[model samples]
Target: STGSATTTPIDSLDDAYITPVQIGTPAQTLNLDFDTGSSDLWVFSSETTASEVXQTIYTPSKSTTAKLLSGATWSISYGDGSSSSGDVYTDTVSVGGLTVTGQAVESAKKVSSSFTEDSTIDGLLGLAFSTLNTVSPTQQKTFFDNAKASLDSPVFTADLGYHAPGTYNFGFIDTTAYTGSITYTAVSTKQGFWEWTSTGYAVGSGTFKSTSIDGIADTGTTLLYLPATVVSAYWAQVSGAKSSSSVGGYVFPCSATLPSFTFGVGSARIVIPGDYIDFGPISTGSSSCFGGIQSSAGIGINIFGDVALKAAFVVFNGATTPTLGFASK
Candidate 1:
């Protein structure tokens, strides 16, 4: 059952660079970046540095419906070495045409240069699957968590297109948007992230090989980061799949025959295209630059970027089950 009264016309900003949403009864508008990587709603506060030039910062005192979670604190590090640390709060949050009450909110005052310098963005509103949620110890929920009950299908879909108008809609998953089966994976509580175990990975048409790596569908990260073993194995297949200590990552031949990689998640099989293996121009020395797939040590996390997501329709249904569904987008 959908909760509360349906807000009309889905309130939105016209010319504003940042989208503003009413977060509580007091009408405090929060400027948020609709990100798909991490699954937590975070906002910058007035306590942040003025030099940061953040578009807008949320002041909890402005919201009559705000409730501070004294014991809750969030500290997260991205693959790029950026991070944010802060506390949690609950309040009514409005985005587009929907409003979620008692939503978990992160107040981040200390952030990395990447976040602080993003003058165009005020805060991050992560819409990724529940597996990417950063809230821990309290098992806190997100805005979608409370809003899912009111949606038609108990799921929300994101239709993000590069160089095109990105869209975020609630309710039913659109089947026509995908070309393959919607891969489903069980949510893991160990890391407070939607960690999906991959069955195998390939580059293009080459042989598919099994991997022990776990893959994450992240909207926050811009690149694909593979583990050492997977990275080494992938390049070993290509002629120029070599590491350039001067370049800082793995380099592969742009003309090399890339293969397709797949991760078998239960009955669903997720596949990645060959173009994703081509990182782009890294050095003037080489005509072709390495793709976003970089060599990173440690069993931290494997992230699938927009390059991978654009091929599928991702439904994050925090309303019914704390699971994320992938179809074609």
Candidate 2:
């Protein structure tokens, strides 16, 4: 009734979290980035015409249970502009013993340069709502959506870490993963995302501001993005911190001590350590370090990505009325 999988960071900066999933009859293992921001389980396969790098491609021909989903195709383009398109297939997919038969697996035929640049990532295992899936003619359900009925609890928890391995548990929550009690909040899926309203924030030891902040908990994203007003206020505390278009987002002197950032979730308060705010130097031998938190002005919506998520234990509950839970880890 429950399944668990270990998630590891691809790099030192915790750029992406990858988990291994077994697919097909003979079990072709592939490391996939479990993304909560997008809804499409796509993979680089023998069908991919893109330039191959270090990624392990899945070969459908070797799988006895693999079947092509005729007349079905999918194309996905991210907000960052990375795109991929390919045909579809149905195969047996399993993660931590949670198996799904006839799962739609999109095989990449064409991929953008950015996709090729990231050699570690084979493809993405989307946990976002299936409504956002890119398959045309007939849309398919996400792995989570397809497995919900069989789960002990229609939920999955994400415990992301900083430069350390974490875990993703499906079906039931691991109470030992976090401290105290979990604070629950309503999730609005009007936009097909795990969107929720945060109960304001506090900078360092500063007073907490009780304003409603609407954002999505996106595991696919690398950084935390907030309102311009909040970002400006936070960076102002750091000497020589400024937003530079050339470097993109905010940067500050490496010598400057960063302050902690705290955001409220119902009555729960989750604090992101100052060290996490410093995303390391912009380039090798550079004294300017980029800020993990950036302005979400042009992005159209705020995103509570890995930077913010790593501070707490988060649960994505796919219940009758979807809800999100957060607790200090």
Candidate 3:
């Protein structure tokens, strides 16, 4: 399924970029957050209550191929405290030009306020290992999991860019899509995430520090999270940087000149630009901005979210050991 089924992801406010997916008969198209942090192809649907109608939903009744999976149900809570629960339906689901017949479409029966009011996304299409699915009484497989056997290779590449749309290529890697050579590192899927330990880190043109950065590549998240020491070191150099409970996490003057931060991926280091660090002001002209890079204190694990992932051409290799490939575009 790699012959040109490239998925074009719509940039959704630089938080969670989304992709348009076709599900069931007559092709009901929905915009979904392509998340690598969880496993479940859940969508906002007609089953949702009036209060949950903030986003467009799929109507299973309108689809001729839809079939109810009576006993199946799903519920999931994200790292950001957003949650959704629903029943299940079996139907055709497609991304780009590739379609998976009989894909499970979890129809939302309930959703949290965060999900209810978020008009940017209709639902989420999980790309993580199927074992991470929250469906019960029996777990379900993800689109990637079900389609892997038909793929030329169990691999997919995510090419995300700042302030621009991106593409997701499946089944095979396109060498022309990335520059330089790809460097790979093994990931531990035991935790149901693409978890890996970094070789080290650095600030601007400074020497690379050789301490380990244990974290996961989470596309569902918005910011780049590192150790408290790393966050403090980088922000300390910025003139107006301060921890603001009002704005949440570290905030600085909108006019501040922030330093570039770098993280070690395999033997190479990826440098994140300073301009990308200013996550935008809290209000129109509030003059206070939140840093895209923050400390992973409350979060159980450090996360290399969109901020970091967008800096590199990432390859999600669903091979024997689940490897992660990185190349600076």
Candidate 4:
């Protein structure tokens, strides 16, 4: 089976992207962040202990197929340390038009302040390897993993856009979604992430620097994170750019001309436009703007987030060999 869905940016900065998902018998629709960094299909539900501002909660009691996973519980923490924990229920879950029966649905019992503050996102649908699943007793598979057997091809594509709606396809690649041939690379799931090694990088139109840069393709993250050396080099090209502690990252004059960033995947080179690097103004009327690219200094690993992924078509292949494919869009 093949399916497709719309991915919409939450705000102008594209801080996060959300997709519609249907859960339960009558189809309880909820907007969820499709995160490739983690493997847990968790959501805001009737069991949520936090005060919800405007989130749609999933009431398991309303679903005929909802079954308690007897003594099962799960918890997850993101990169910045925000977290959530809950109990599990198996129910019919669908994304786009593809449906999977007996899919583990984690209902949130408690959520972090950041999550409670975000009104739009109802929960998260993890797309990373199942090895990262947080369920105790027995781990659960990701939506992609559970749906793989029924998919025409065990793969999914993420076509994230810049302040616009994009597309997510399951089972097969949309020939019209991207241009040129896809460059394939090996993925190391050692850490249960879509981690791959980038051949090298180039600052704008400068000479391509041939070096190995290992990172993960994370849709949940908002910006592009690379080595401090590479990030500094890119920012140096901007006249008034500086790593400001007050601002929390490299920021520069809003009027400064930014340089494009390019990274290699096998023999293919994906270029992120200079305008994309100019994330946006630091404040409503501030002169300094926050950069879309930042250093991965303390993060333990680099990440190619929406800022970089939007510049290309990404494939999260779950078939044998577990590979990642990239193509210019």
Candidate 5:
């Protein structure tokens, strides 16, 4: 039987997508951020602080099937500085409708303030390569890894949306979910990311820059981050755009003209409309709006975040031969 799970985003804060996850026997549900940037399946368990947290926490003792992985500990800190640490457990974990009988579940004993402040984020469910899994003594496999063996295609598709709802489909691709042909690129998982080199990009009607840009297709990230030169060029097209010292990234007057961005995927061009690139504002009622395009600190890689992904239907292939597929929606 083919296994597939379609998880709807639970309140996307223009930053991350949280999905419902079930763990252990008699199942406890947790709202976890499905991050493609890292590898670790952690939850706010009985061991974590949930004084005022509204989200459900995992109580290992309540699950007859829960067993601690002896001497196994896990600690993870996100690029956003949000972090959590604790022991590990081998239990039944379910995503979408697929079940993983012996998945490693990290139980957080301590979490950073970023996680505590956003009480809704109970924990993180990492979708990155298994090589990046942070569990010590025994590196654990992600929910996808365990379920792939039973899947018909060993693939997952992400169709993120704007203010509306979006879903993550596992083990199979729904052809009707998107338009156009799916253009694929070989993924370089050297850094344990869904990384690839984009052939080039273009702004509006301008000539496309043929320079290859290395970046990751990160569902966990919120905005599109590129090199300084690329970021500057995109923002330059918008009038009154300036790099704000007070607020990070480029901010422009609400009235400025925005341009569409097009990235190349194996000679296929996927265009992100200008409106989609306008990532809200620095504050409520503020005249200055933050741009979706920002500069990566010469860190040698760009991040194609939700702002970019929402424009297309993306497939994350996780077989012996892994690659990425993209198509406009």
Candidate 6:
């Protein structure tokens, strides 16, 4: 399943970093992850070390449209051990042909190894729930908060297609591209994120079984993480899926047949492909390499990452529903 919609970045060139749009006179270029797990936009700054990627970094003093939030700091840690620390600033931000003036932006002063290493990516733009927004106490509005008024519908939808890497448009919701009925799920604002209750889960070719785990479809995360019980049940359906003591995740034969799993959100069903379960190739021992699907503990949260979203069209209705809507792509 795939959705069709034009995705245009705020900037023209992949390296240009930022672009000016019509909504606001001047908007800072931002590096965004288009994450479905969280809703917030963050950027690397000139205050950061020199060795970092030279993409467009927001400088409050440089932009006439910039507004500073004195004494406000924002911090976030990812599941991959990457962390960012920054102060809050408000300025015009643009994406998908829409601009939000006085939009909340984070100016990072500190970063973790992951951020430091990935020099090419300037920062992550979260698109999950407003609850996961890290804009800080002084600024409550996200980029979506201000841009929603310009949209055709009271909603903003994302149709991520597996094409050559490109930025998807933001402000416009191409309703014509979506054929099936849209399913809405109520949002649970708790523990600093917009988490929701998952009705059930299923493994390859297995029956859909109800689960107690909560599911968050995050675009920032690359892998699928589930509870121990769910993980075990999933592996049991595959011939070679097993736990690896060395790698610390579930390892399986790359060629092993995988089953498609579906997660039920209200009456909506988000189907995850078998290929997602079959994480591509990875080298193991001298003569063998294994597929990637890991058994993780201590996450305390179940996350459905890009692998899951690749098979569905995820709609984030921040303006009206304030909840997540799912439909077949």
Summing lDDT over every window of 10 consecutive residues in candidate 1, give the lowest-scoring window.
7-16
User: Model 1, 179-265: lDDT tens per residue?
Assistant: 766766655445655556666666555666775567776655555677777767666766767788776777776677666555455
Ranking by lDDT: 4, 2, 3, 5, 1, 6
lDDT of each: 0.63, 0.92, 0.85, 0.94, 0.84, 0.61
lDDT by residue for model 5 over 281-309, one digit each (tens)? 67778898899989987445699998899
Could you list the CA RMSD of all candidates, in the order they appear? Answer: 5.9, 1.0, 1.6, 0.9, 1.7, 5.0
> Model 6: which ten-residue window has the lowest total lDDT?
11-20
Model 3 lDDT per residue over 101-179, tens place: 8888999999899887778788999988888998888888999887788888998788777877778877888888777
| Per-model TM against the reference | 0.74, 0.98, 0.96, 0.99, 0.95, 0.81
Model 6: lDDT of residue 257: 70
By TM-score, who's the top model here? 4
lDDT of 6: 0.61
Candidate maximizing lDDT: 4
Deviation from native of the Cα of residue 130 in model 2, angstroms: 0.8
> Candidate 1 — which residues are off by over 4 angstroms?
1-39, 61-76, 86-89, 127-139, 162-165, 236-241, 252-262, 266-269, 283-288, 317-324
> Distance (Å) between predicted and true CA of 218, model 4?
0.3
Task: Report the Cα lDDT for residue 211, model 6.
Answer: 67
Error of 5 at 307 (Å): 0.8
lDDT of 6 by residue, 1-329 (tens): 11222443332112112222221234455545555655556777876666644455666677777777777778887777778878877777666556556777777887776666654566766655456676667545665556667655445565554422423445545566566877877766565344667778777666778765676756566666777787787778877777777866777777677877777777677777776566544553322234333444667777766556556666666654367777775
lDDT, model 5: 0.84
Q: Candidate 5: count the clashes.
A: 0
Segments of candidate 2 deviating more than 4 angstroms: 50-54
How far does residue 94 in candidate 4 sit from its true spot (Å)?
0.7
